[PDB]
Amino acid sequence: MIQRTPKIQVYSRHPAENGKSNFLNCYVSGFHPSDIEVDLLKNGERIEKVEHSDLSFSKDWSFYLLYYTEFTPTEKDEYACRVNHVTLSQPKIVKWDRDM
Amino acid sequence: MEAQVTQNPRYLITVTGKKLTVTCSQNMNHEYMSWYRQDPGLGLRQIYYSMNVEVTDKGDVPEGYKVSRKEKRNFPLILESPSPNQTSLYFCASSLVSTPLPKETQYFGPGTRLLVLEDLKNVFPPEVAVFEPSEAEISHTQKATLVCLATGFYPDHVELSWWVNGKEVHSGVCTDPQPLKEQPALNDSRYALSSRLRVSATFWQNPRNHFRCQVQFYGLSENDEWTQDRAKPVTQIVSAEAWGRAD
Amino acid sequence: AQKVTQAQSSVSMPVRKAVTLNCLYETSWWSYYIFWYKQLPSKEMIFLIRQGSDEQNAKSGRYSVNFKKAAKSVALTISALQLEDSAKYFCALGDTAGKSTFGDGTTLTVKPNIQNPDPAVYQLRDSKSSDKSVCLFTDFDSQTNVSQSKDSDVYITDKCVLDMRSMDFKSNSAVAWSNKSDFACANAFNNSIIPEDTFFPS
Amino acid sequence: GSHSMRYFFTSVSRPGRGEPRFIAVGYVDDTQFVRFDSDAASQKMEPRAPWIEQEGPEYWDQETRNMKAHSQTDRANLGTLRGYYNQSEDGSHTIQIMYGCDVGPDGRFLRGYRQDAYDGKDYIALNEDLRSWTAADMAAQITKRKWEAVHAAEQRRVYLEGRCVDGLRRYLENGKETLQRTDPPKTHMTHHPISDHEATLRCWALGFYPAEITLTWQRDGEDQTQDTELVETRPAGDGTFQKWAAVVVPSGEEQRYTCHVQHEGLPKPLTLRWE
Amino acid sequence: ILDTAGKEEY
């Protein structure tokens, strides 16, 4: 079987501005097979009410999902996405970097 | 490889509340099979249908019926506890796929006449009689019409055929499309049915020609209970015949 | 709602002409098919043709559909009528997943062209018994209408077309009988209006 | 200004965990509008765009019945392929299906597609002519012969040229406000020193619909195909998309570089420069 | 709107 590791992107829906409401997104794509665990993190802690898109896939048959939650960012609050997949030995954590 | 849908039984008289199953099968590896019931005078009401193996869906009138679809060949109709208002003409249909292409056919089985009754005491086979041509028609037209009459039967589960010199005939025949009630005011009225066979006067005038009107009556089976004195009204043939007669 | 409507309960037309059988429907379905079926007097059911809701007018042999989608009207037209077309015709709607809705059908009688009518009432005697006879009204042309018995001890069938194929000869007939004392062929069909030159043998 | 309707099916066996899971999603262009998930409590096709919520209860019932039938065939198909490839009931396997149609701006059929995959790889596909099949390997050739024998190709073609086009038309009308929009990308460029000799230039495209887009770098007007990173177009979650392209440049040469943005919403292509 | 499930057994 062909196993493909997820590509992970963590970003905001809108340009980030402290104190104003936004959405934090974790987009995982290019992975196969379809089982995957995704969590959004606020200062290392799992965020509770997180939603995700319905499973679909791309032309090459690899899957993609969007996980997302409402949040208001500040200066010192750190956010990240933690992902586990059979292609990965440990949960992989990608931190949110607003200035990229 | 002749395409066909088979229903068994084609005729059934049964007592209220006795579980029964009507089988439907096709050997064309069709995905789609459907059951319908047709009450007299009306269209087909869908009961259950099956888009493929292990897929079933309710039609408009599923109550009192169940189906199953364990394999492509078979789609049985199950009546757990038959009641009088399930008396109807039942059709099983099939097609290769649930929405056929323009050139693909929807196949129908021959129909199952089901009659659910409180008891079988009113079932009566027909009496049959053949009425010979009148000399006046022969004189006037040089043709001779024979008439067959089946009378006194219940229910109207009958097929009438003509046999001339041992061979079934359809040329020159017309049979009533439905039997008529002998007592139209009674719900269990017996029935009567008439048929005509017309031949040339010269054919009627050959005494070597043999005419037989045959009525197949579909009645009780060997394993139906019967306690009345009169003969058990089983499935049976009743015939009457005539010979040609020189002028 | 979900209703298919065939408003003409019955229709008659001469052999060799064309007939149009109407069908109107109501449905909230916006993708569907329309099926036309032919039910013979034997009660055998036969599929004729289906019309797709996205397709041009369906046509096959002597059958064609006049699909008028905005009007939800799907009349079937049969050309070059043959006697074999006499049957009950059903209009039905189906969805994209095997469900269907039937109208209650339209009975079509194709009337043969009787070229040498010879209306007559004959008496026929039982091949066995002496009591029993039957009266036969025959050779009338297709304009004549046989009326139902209005007397419950007299039995009268509908008219019936037989076709003597080898001779290319068609004829209509109806049968009447009774067990009552004064039943006679002269009176049998008195509840119908029959040609006034109907032959009654002397 | 063509448009598309596409359905994406995913069926996964779970040896050790009951029946398979069956999922399907439907899209018009890059907007999803329906979903089915056999794990969910509904057991029904469900709406995922406001302009499909119009559809009455019979649409939902009919879509659910076609999904239920599709899933039963996928269940059987997982067993058949297991046998074809001498796999075991202990393994988890995946069948994926995509089909759909494209229409021109007048609403008229341009092309149709149907393609099937097993464990993430092509299995069988309907060819462009919608009349013949391409089988990816010897097992799929068994399927090809079966499908020819029952004229599956015409069965798909009638849907793709017919019902698919008709539904796509209806949905575009009913959702005309949102489906007929083109949102051009809002663009900008960031600059991040790596070294004292190197810096990352990143060219950003935001808020654009539909997703199709091209972001290219040039060096002195010559296409830069050399250290040009490029991420996967991603959803904003509000119905728009985002993408960026980055290059590493020698510190001091930032102005030799241009970023070119091509999108449907752009009268002519954008050229961006760090200045 | 979905295609009709049919003619697609492997």
Residue numbers in the entry:
A (entry chain B): 0 to 99
B (entry chain E): 0 to 246
C (entry chain D): 1 to 202
D (entry chain A): 1 to 275
E (entry chain C): 1 to 10
Provide the publication's sentences verbatim.
TCR N17.1.2 was isolated by screening TILs from patients with melanoma for reactivity toward the mutated NRASQ61K neoantigen. Here, we report crystal structures of a TCR (N17.1.2) from a patient with melanoma that recognizes both NRASQ61K and NRASQ61R neoepitopes in complex with NRASQ61K–HLA-A*01 and NRASQ61R–HLA-A*01 as well as the structure of the unbound TCR. The TCRs are restricted by the prevalent major histocompatibility complex (MHC) class I allele HLA-A*01:01 (15). However, NRAS mutations dominate in melanomas, with mutations at position 61 appearing in ~20% of patients.
